[PDB]
Amino acid sequence: TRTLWTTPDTSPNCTIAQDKDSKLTLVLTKCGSQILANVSLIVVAGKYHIINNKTNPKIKSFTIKLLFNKNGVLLDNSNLGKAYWNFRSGNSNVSTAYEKAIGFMPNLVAYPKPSNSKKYARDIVYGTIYLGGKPDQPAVIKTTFNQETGCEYSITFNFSWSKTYENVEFETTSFTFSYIAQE
Amino acid sequence: YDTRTLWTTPDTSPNCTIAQDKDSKLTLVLTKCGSQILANVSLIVVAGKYHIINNKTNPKIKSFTIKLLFNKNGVLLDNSNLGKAYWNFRSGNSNVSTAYEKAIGFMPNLVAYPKPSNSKKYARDIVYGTIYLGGKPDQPAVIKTTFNQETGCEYSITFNFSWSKTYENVEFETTSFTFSYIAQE
Amino acid sequence: TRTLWTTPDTSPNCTIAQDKDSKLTLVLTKCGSQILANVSLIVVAGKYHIINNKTNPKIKSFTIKLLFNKNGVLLDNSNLGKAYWNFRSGNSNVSTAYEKAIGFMPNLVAYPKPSNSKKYARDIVYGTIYLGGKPDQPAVIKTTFNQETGCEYSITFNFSWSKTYENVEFETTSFTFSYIAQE
Ligand SMILES: COC(=O)N[C@H]1[C@H]([C@H](O)[C@H](O)CO)O[C@@](O)(C(=O)O)C[C@@H]1O
Numbered sequence: 001t002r003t004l005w006t007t008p009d010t011s012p013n014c015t016i017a018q019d020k021d022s023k024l025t026l027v028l029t030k031c032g033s034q035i036l037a038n039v040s041l042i043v044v045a046g047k048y049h050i051i052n053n054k055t056n057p058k059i060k061s062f063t064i065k066l067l068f069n070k071n072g073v074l075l076d077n078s079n080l081g082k083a084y085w086n087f088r089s090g091n092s093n094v095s096t097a098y099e100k101a102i103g104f105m106p107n108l109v110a111y112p113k114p115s116n117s118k119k120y121a122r123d124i125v126y127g128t129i130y131l132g133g134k135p136d137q138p139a140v141i142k143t144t145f146n147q148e149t150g151c152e153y154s155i156t157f158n159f160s161w162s163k164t165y166e167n168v169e170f171e172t173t174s175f176t177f178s179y180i181a182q183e
Numbered sequence: 184y185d186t187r188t189l190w191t192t193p194d195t196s197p198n199c200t201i202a203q204d205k206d207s208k209l210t211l212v213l214t215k216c217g218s219q220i221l222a223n224v225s226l227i228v229v230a231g232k233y234h235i236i237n238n239k240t241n242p243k244i245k246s247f248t249i250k251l252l253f254n255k256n257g258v259l260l261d262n263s264n265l266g267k268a269y270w271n272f273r274s275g276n277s278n279v280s281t282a283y284e285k286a287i288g289f290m291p292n293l294v295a296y297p298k299p300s301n302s303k304k305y306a307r308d309i310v311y312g313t314i315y316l317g318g319k320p321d322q323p324a325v326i327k328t329t330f331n332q333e334t335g336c337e338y339s340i341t342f343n344f345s346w347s348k349t350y351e352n353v354e355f356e357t358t359s360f361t362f363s364y365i366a367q368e
Numbered sequence: 369t370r371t372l373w374t375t376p377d378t379s380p381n382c383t384i385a386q387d388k389d390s391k392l393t394l395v396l397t398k399c400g401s402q403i404l405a406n407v408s409l410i411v412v413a414g415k416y417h418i419i420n421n422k423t424n425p426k427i428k429s430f431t432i433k434l435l436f437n438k439n440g441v442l443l444d445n446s447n448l449g450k451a452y453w454n455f456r457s458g459n460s461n462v463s464t465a466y467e468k469a470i471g472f473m474p475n476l477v478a479y480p481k482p483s484n485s486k487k488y489a490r491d492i493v494y495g496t497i498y499l500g501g502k503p504d505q506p507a508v509i510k511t512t513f514n515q516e517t518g519c520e521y522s523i524t525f526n527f528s529w530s531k532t533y534e535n536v537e538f539e540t541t542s543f544t545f546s547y548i549a550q551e
């Protein structure tokens with residue numbers, strides 16, 4: 001079982017500001033010691049669905065958190081819903097919730113939890129995606145590994161933008177990255 | 184499919200037609216890593232309209248498009264910009280001795296990236312990258328890759344190259360870019 | 369044998385300006401005829417540790433070279449130490465030094481040695497990483513394949529920056545790329 005994913009449909013699966021306000025599409029493919037990751041976001045309703053920074057000058061970022069336990073199982077305080085995250089079966093998920101996915105977790109030696117030791121930047125990957133596929137509508141996607149509390153592992157996606165957008169729907173192009181696997 | 188590589192071969196022999204016949208070498212390597220295809224791409228334009236860019240004399244020459252069209256079996260169609268002759272599964276630094284029949288597991292996922300319809304068109308079927316002409320850090324061009332948006336095909340991968348700098352007699356040959364996409368199977 | 373790496377610890381393994389002044393974290397994972405590569409750099413000491421271009425306007429770039437022989441073994445004139453460059457075992461290396469790694473080497477037809485033939489740019493990958501994980505502290509990472517001499521293969525990482533940084537520590541976010549393997 002080599003791919004954990006959200007199913008690539010458009011059905012809301014994620015809660016940023018209000019219940020099921022978004023569809024996160026995330027595909028994690030195990031290539032041995034690295035996980036190959038592909039992500040995009042469609043916000044379907046609520047506060048982040050249409051950005052207007054004339055109306056709301058300070059609405060410039062938000063975060064989606066995936067929190068995992070010692071067995072790599074998604075925790076319910078995650079923004080992504082548990083029902084929607086599983087190993088691939090065809091164009092869907094297997095019908096039964098998985099019990100172990102440690103091989104897909106971000107490596108804790110590469111990406112340690114917060115402590116009193118010096119924090120290094122290598123637990124971050126920066127990328128840029130484009131709202132509505134327009135090259136003049138960039139938004140930064142910052143991905144951080146294992147920096148959340150209340151979990152053994154975490155992947156967080158912070159979305160932010162510096163431009164003053166006026167009535168721009170928040171739905172994105174796709175971005176690929178990788179990270180070092182725990183096992 | 185499992186873990187194979189579909190590619191253009193890594194030589195520099197023109198295999199592609201943008202403005203005139205065989206004016207370019209598209210180097211494209213698609214490697215299957217389960218439910219994702221790891222893609223690596225670069226371009227050398229060797230002749231014709233897009234070979235030497237001068238936006239002082241020709242300010243409107245700012246973009247061009249290379250289309251790969253596929254049938255239900257993932258076989259490349261003759262009318263793509265990329266020639267069929269050397270697009271095949273890898274064997275050594277060349278290709279297998281049979282033109283391939285089946286590569287559906289190298290195709291862009293149709294649920295992820297639907298064909299045009301009157302349903303809402305979402306941006307996730309696009310990946311943006313930036314490559315550099317001549318390997319110079321001050322000569323960016325944008326490579327926009329779009330999945331399954333062409334007609335007359337079951338699947339498609341389309342590369343649009345564009346630039347906003349005013350280049351003066353700059354040869355369009357590029358650094359390499361890597362992306363991935365969700366596989367059909 | 370699918371992963372050649374530096375280990376994910378933070379122990380210095382690399383000499384930029386002085387002995388073991390840095391940790392290059394480099395993970396090469398063989399996904400058939402493409403190598404999936406993940407890299408970051410922490411500078412701990414020396415000339416490139418704390419960048420101050422008010423004080424030292426000329427300090428704008430440096431290079432880290434990995435040079436390989438015909439069997440894909442790291443030559444000791446590389447900036448990276450041979451001591452911990454090996455195939456993966458857990459969060460560590462295999463017990464004995466590897467003797468063949470040609471399947472991890474950059475392809476010589478794709479990325480030829482310098483010659484009289486026209487030099488093409490496809491043997492370069494550009495990326496941007498962020499010092500200290502700050503989005504306003506970019507530095508460019510330029511990776512070049514097989515352009516060094518006195519070797520069968522090479523991978524070189526050039527780091528440079530255009531901003532006038534005042535007391536900014538050179539430690540980076542992570543970047544992923546790929547390249548065509550020799551076999
Ligand atoms: C890959 O797409 C981009 O790099 N978009 C940048 C964009 C683009 O270069 C320009 O608008 C020409 O169409 O310039 C930008 O300054 C912009 O905001 O438009 C930054 C984008 O990331």
Ligand SMILES: COC(=O)N[C@H]1[C@H]([C@H](O)[C@H](O)CO)O[C@@](O)(C(=O)O)C[C@@H]1O
Nearest residue numbers: 313320321322323494495496508509530
């Ligand atoms: C990865 O390489 C780049 O980001 N190159 C940018 C380049 C570079 O920072 C500068 O010329 C100093 O060398 O700045 C640019 O504004 C430029 O066109 O020079 C955009 C390039 O994408």
Ligand SMILES: COC(=O)N[C@H]1[C@H]([C@H](O)[C@H](O)CO)O[C@@](O)(C(=O)O)C[C@@H]1O
Nearest residue numbers: 126127128140141162496503504505506
């Ligand atoms: C992925 O991060 C970036 O694209 N950082 C750019 C950064 C950023 O957009 C801005 O400072 C707001 O955070 O603007 C920059 O002009 C900068 O140097 O700050 C270039 C960075 O590559």
Ligand SMILES: [Zn+2]
Nearest residue numbers: 044049050169
């Ligand atoms: Zn709406």
Ligand SMILES: [Zn+2]
Nearest residue numbers: 228229234354
């Ligand atoms: Zn030329």
Ligand SMILES: [Zn+2]
Nearest residue numbers: 411412417537
């Ligand atoms: Zn330090």
